[PDB]
Amino acid sequence: PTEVIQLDWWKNCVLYQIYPRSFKDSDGDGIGDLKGIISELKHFVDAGVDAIWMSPIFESPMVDFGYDISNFYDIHYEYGTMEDFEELLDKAHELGLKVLLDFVPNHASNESEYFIKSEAREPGYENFFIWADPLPNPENPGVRLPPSNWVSQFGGSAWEWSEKRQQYYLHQFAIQQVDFDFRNPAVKQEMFNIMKFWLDKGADGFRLDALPYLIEADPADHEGRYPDDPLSGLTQFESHQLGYTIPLYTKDLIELYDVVYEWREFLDEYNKNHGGDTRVVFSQGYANVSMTMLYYGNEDGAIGAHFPFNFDFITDLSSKSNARDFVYIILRWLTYMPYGGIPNWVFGNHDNNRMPTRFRHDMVDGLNIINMLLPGVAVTYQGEEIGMRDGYVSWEDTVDIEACNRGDPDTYHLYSRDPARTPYHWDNSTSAGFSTSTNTWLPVAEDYQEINLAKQKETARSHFKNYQALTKLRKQATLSHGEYDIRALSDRTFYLVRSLPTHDTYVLLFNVSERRDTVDLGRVPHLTLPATVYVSSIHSARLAGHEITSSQLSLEAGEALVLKAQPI
Amino acid sequence: VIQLDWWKNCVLYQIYPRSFKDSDGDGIGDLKGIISELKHFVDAGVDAIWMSPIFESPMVDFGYDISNFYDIHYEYGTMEDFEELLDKAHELGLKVLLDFVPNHASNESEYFIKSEAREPGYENFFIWADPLPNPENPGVRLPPSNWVSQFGGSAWEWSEKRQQYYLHQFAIQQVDFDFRNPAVKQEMFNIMKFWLDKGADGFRLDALPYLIEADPADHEGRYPDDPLSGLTQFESHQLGYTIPLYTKDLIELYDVVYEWREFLDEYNKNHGGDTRVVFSQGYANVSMTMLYYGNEDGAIGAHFPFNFDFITDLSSKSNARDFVYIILRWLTYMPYGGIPNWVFGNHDNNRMPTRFRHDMVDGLNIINMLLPGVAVTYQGEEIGMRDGYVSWEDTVDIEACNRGDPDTYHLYSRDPARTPYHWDNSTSAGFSTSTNTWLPVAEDYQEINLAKQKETARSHFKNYQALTKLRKQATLSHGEYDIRALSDRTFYLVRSLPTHDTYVLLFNVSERRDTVDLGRVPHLTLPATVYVSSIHSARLAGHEITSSQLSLEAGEALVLKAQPI
Ligand SMILES: *[C@@H]1O[C@H](CO)[C@@H](O)[C@H](O)[C@H]1O
Numbered sequence A: 001p002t003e004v005i006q007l008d009w010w011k012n013c014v015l016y017q018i019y020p021r022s023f024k025d026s027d028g029d030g031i032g033d034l035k036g037i038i039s040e041l042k043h044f045v046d047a048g049v050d051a052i053w054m055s056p057i058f059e060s061p062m063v064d065f066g067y068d069i070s071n072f073y074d075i076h077y078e079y080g081t082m083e084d085f086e087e088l089l090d091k092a093h094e095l096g097l098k099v100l101l102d103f104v105p106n107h108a109s110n111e112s113e114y115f116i117k118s119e120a121r122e123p124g125y126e127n128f129f130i131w132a133d134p135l136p137n138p139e140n141p142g143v144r145l146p147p148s149n150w151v152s153q154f155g156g157s158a159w160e161w162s163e164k165r166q167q168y169y170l171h172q173f174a175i176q177q178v179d180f181d182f183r184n185p186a187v188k189q190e191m192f193n194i195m196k197f198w199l200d201k202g203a204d205g206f207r208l209d210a211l212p213y214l215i216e217a218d219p220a221d222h223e224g225r226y227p228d229d230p231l232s233g234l235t236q237f238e239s240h241q242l243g244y245t246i247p248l249y250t251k252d253l254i255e256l257y258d259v260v261y262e263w264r265e266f267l268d269e270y271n272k273n274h275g276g277d278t279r280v281v282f283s284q285g286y287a288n289v290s291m292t293m294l295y296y297g298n299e300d301g302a303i304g305a306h307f308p309f310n311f312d313f314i315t316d317l318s319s320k321s322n323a324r325d326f327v328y329i330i331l332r333w334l335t336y337m338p339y340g341g342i343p344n345w346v347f348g349n350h351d352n353n354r355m356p357t358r359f360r361h362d363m364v365d366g367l368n369i370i371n372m373l374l375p376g377v378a379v380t381y382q383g384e385e386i387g388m389r390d391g392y393v394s395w396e397d398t399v400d401i402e403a404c405n406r407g408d409p410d411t412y413h414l415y416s417r418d419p420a421r422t423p424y425h426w427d428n429s430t431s432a433g434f435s436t437s438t439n440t441w442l443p444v445a446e447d448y449q450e451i452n453l454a455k456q457k458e459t460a461r462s463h464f465k466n467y468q469a470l471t472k473l474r475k476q477a478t479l480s481h482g483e484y485d486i487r488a489l490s491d492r493t494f495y496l497v498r499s500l501p502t503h504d505t506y507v508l509l510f511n512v513s514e515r516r517d518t519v520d521l522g523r524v525p526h527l528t529l530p531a532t533v534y535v536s537s538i539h540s541a542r543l544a545g546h547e548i549t550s551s552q553l554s555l556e557a558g559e560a561l562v563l564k565a566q567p568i
Numbered sequence B: 001v002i003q004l005d006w007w008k009n010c011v012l013y014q015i016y017p018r019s020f021k022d023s024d025g026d027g028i029g030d031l032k033g034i035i036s037e038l039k040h041f042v043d044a045g046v047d048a049i050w051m052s053p054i055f056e057s058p059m060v061d062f063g064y065d066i067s068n069f070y071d072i073h074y075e076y077g078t079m080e081d082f083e084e085l086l087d088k089a090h091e092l093g094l095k096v097l098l099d100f101v102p103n104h105a106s107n108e109s110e111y112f113i114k115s116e117a118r119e120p121g122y123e124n125f126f127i128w129a130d131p132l133p134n135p136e137n138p139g140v141r142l143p144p145s146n147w148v149s150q151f152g153g154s155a156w157e158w159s160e161k162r163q164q165y166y167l168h169q170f171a172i173q174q175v176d177f178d179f180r181n182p183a184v185k186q187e188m189f190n191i192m193k194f195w196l197d198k199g200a201d202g203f204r205l206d207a208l209p210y211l212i213e214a215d216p217a218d219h220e221g222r223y224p225d226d227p228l229s230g231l232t233q234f235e236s237h238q239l240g241y242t243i244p245l246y247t248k249d250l251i252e253l254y255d256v257v258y259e260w261r262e263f264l265d266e267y268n269k270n271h272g273g274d275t276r277v278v279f280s281q282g283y284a285n286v287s288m289t290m291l292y293y294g295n296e297d298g299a300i301g302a303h304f305p306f307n308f309d310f311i312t313d314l315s316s317k318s319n320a321r322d323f324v325y326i327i328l329r330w331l332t333y334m335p336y337g338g339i340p341n342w343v344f345g346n347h348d349n350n351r352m353p354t355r356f357r358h359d360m361v362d363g364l365n366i367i368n369m370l371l372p373g374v375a376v377t378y379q380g381e382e383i384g385m386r387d388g389y390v391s392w393e394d395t396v397d398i399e400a401c402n403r404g405d406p407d408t409y410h411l412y413s414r415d416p417a418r419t420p421y422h423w424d425n426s427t428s429a430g431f432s433t434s435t436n437t438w439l440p441v442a443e444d445y446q447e448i449n450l451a452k453q454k455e456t457a458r459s460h461f462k463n464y465q466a467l468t469k470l471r472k473q474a475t476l477s478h479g480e481y482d483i484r485a486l487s488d489r490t491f492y493l494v495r496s497l498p499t500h501d502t503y504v505l506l507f508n509v510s511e512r513r514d515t516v517d518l519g520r521v522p523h524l525t526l527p528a529t530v531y532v533s534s535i536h537s538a539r540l541a542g543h544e545i546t547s548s549q550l551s552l553e554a555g556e557a558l559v560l561k562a563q564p565i
């Protein structure tokens, strides 16, 4: 068995997204907190997680549960103190974990000192945000028009009138989330200042949110006005409704990538000047594949985020997908990613329905196997390691500003992100062990007695035990250094093979369909029989250690196997 | 390497007969014309030809409106000319496929006249529905549903004779058969049996996505409205106004196709000789397209449905990563054992060099010839023919006439891809002795013609010949494929086969020079020999590639011959 050089930590980490409000409540207020995370850092070691990122924990009025940041240099009081954060870093680092911070560079709370100073036209802050005059209305001079038809992601105009300043400010998100002017060198310098502060504290890097919205059209390019976004011309949207416009002037502007490349320059300089393990930036943006790959860098030699997140398992695959769709979407990242790009795989987050809800309850293990066996970085969202489902959230219990703004009692479910933010299922105790109180900030999902971590640790076969076996398998040279081959055997079943001369072969077989499928293992490259089941889905006929001798393999709907075969 | 049945790796050439060769100076291509140039297919290294329809037709849709599925269109010639074409093609080793459209018949067909007059056994040959009353103006009949014709306007036409609407997914003159009528399904078997008895090597079957529409029996006796697109740019008479939920890709259409294949399998068993095939045409999403091959329940359909991805999903707007990702789509979705095919043009779409670029013609023909399976060539692609200019005044395409006007006809017209074939630099590019050609000859025929390309050292046609010859190599018939983008500008396609020479396409699909590391290309050992280069390449056939660093100019494609793996 050949010797392999270990990869840089960020090229093949298991990265786990914590939603701190919903992870662990240590003080009975029904709100997850830093002492809660600290008390369960051992969970990440137990799970085989290398790195955690937290949804925002900075001072925030909580309009968008942390994404409206009023102070980028201190901790939100409900989550705890700077001292709790420093204790979290110390204890995480002692356990060998990396810790990344999430913040949204696009915007600040209207309660931030930046915005208070800006609205007052304070020297240094007047132009910190996008401030615009009304569009001249010569035909009805007493009727004030917004600068353009731009629509907020949370509904209504992206322009809010300031009585104090007698101008509109831009908010691509909530009224309380004010868009920085990213053509302002002082805004760009402030972003370096924020990152330097948290790197100096010992953060191992950043997840940076909402990057497609950084830059909007310069009125200088449109005869001194903000240009209207083109109309979608879809009958089902009026001017206050997201979908009314195509964001040609408000999203994916080529200038945003220059800001990202400057962030990478800054981080490269920081790493050179501090040594120890590489500090990284992982970018978030929902965009088409071309716009997504520009986050890595460009073919003029620019270098950007260590990677942009791959949301293809959220946006392009679901329970509607067959095995050919799975393979074809997996191939999209691998086909479009630049030479030397690190692939990553995301199955969920706090903005989207949970993995088993988007797919099916019988597919959890197969989805975690894909995550863990594809080359590069596995990304796990809080709860995927135990197969948590969307929780039921009534209109009455809904707190997501997106649903409160865009929805009503009949439609709120089309918008609300709350079902994927329900408290983590630790055990079958009061509130699934998330809290000692029956009062939790979102309702605990009704299935917690059936789906909880403690039950999965006790029972012979579980989502969590499969998760542990897969994160353990990623330490094998075959998964860190091995080649990959992926093809559909049928509309129902695909294989993913990891192989490496002189090292064991590992094969995923996954029936993603609602029907049984019999496949010819003779078609699977590098699969020599007999082979051993390393991992099986929790209801597979095959237990771990089951010998596969026949070339004919019948798989149930949703059944997934990892086979261990002799080296190539 | 066991010999493949002919249709698994044939070079298939689509003839548009009206535009191929005029033998009789009426400016209309004809069968004696085709017969006179059958040697062209041998010269080019074409194995099989299919013709756009040549059956009796009022020519409203230039042959796709068929008034008699059992005889030849007089302008193209006679049954005897067809029998001669088959005779001489088979002598030259060629296969000949007939195109007919099972979906619809000419309103001048006996089927229609008899159906409209309610003649017994013909009453239900076509889709006949009652009008709806009109809230706005009671005197004005409304059609059975909001269904929109592929050529614009309602898919329902009123018959004064029958006092009912008939369905036409295409032209008013193209009447949709009822494919739930066993007598209609029998008549298709009768038409196929007739032409297979004549010696045809199989069929191209048109417009299959449109065979079957919603049964009113499943909608309380009414034809259900297609959903609205809700797109403000489309009015109720314009294609795009509806989503064809009840009018296209109904699962029942595939059962008809599986029955056709069952009939052909029986015929092939009972007659022996060379396999007679069915290749299906349908523009549909990839999963609905794959159902034409067969289904997972074990149904067997068309020998293959045509792959239109180089028409629908790639263009001059595409980068190397797009090329790779779109090529992977057929290869990812195709059933195990399926034959891949590659289509770069047809008589319904702009010519290959117009959709892409003039400097990409060689690369595109290399892709066609070097990918696994079947290369499909549309008349003109072997010489890099460009779209012809066709004024409103000279436009004869019903689609442009019905959907378009002097300022918009170019958005819809298929005529630019149907201009006469460029044989030489003689009158009408040698298509005809006459200057009275049914469509105007493209302005560039003096620059782009088969004769010129045969007598210049380097040409699209000589590259085409080099590539059809290369398909005889086991590496291309049986070899593995590896395909990846080296950059946004350049991709490789490697064919490899243990102990047989490796063949490598490098293609810069961009408008800019690109320098690639050939060390990244699998199975490529240097030195390698240029087998084929783009006509504008600095590299000639026989040139040795010795450096690992290769600069490709805009549109430049090389086929390298390299050491066996
Ligand atoms: C990215 O950004 C928006 C606004 O900050 C937030 O609502 C989402 O939760 C986040 O992923």
Ligand SMILES: *[C@@H]1O[C@H](CO)[C@@H](O)[C@H](O)[C@H]1O
Pocket (backbone or CB within 6 Å): B061, B064, B065, B101, B170, B206, B207, B347, B348
């Ligand atoms: C398929 O069918 C339509 C109608 O018959 C025709 O106009 C096209 O030319 C053909 O490819």
Ligand SMILES: [Ca+2]
Pocket (backbone or CB within 6 Å): A106, A172, A179, A180, A213, A214, A215, A216
């Ligand atoms: Ca912005």
Ligand SMILES: [Ca+2]
Pocket (backbone or CB within 6 Å): B103, B169, B176, B177, B210, B211, B212, B213
């Ligand atoms: Ca039909």
Ligand SMILES: [Mg+2]
Pocket (backbone or CB within 6 Å): A024, A025, A026, A027, A028, A029, A030, A031, A032, A033, A078
């Ligand atoms: Mg708490």
Ligand SMILES: [Mg+2]
Pocket (backbone or CB within 6 Å): B021, B022, B023, B024, B025, B026, B027, B028, B029, B030, B075
């Ligand atoms: Mg003629």
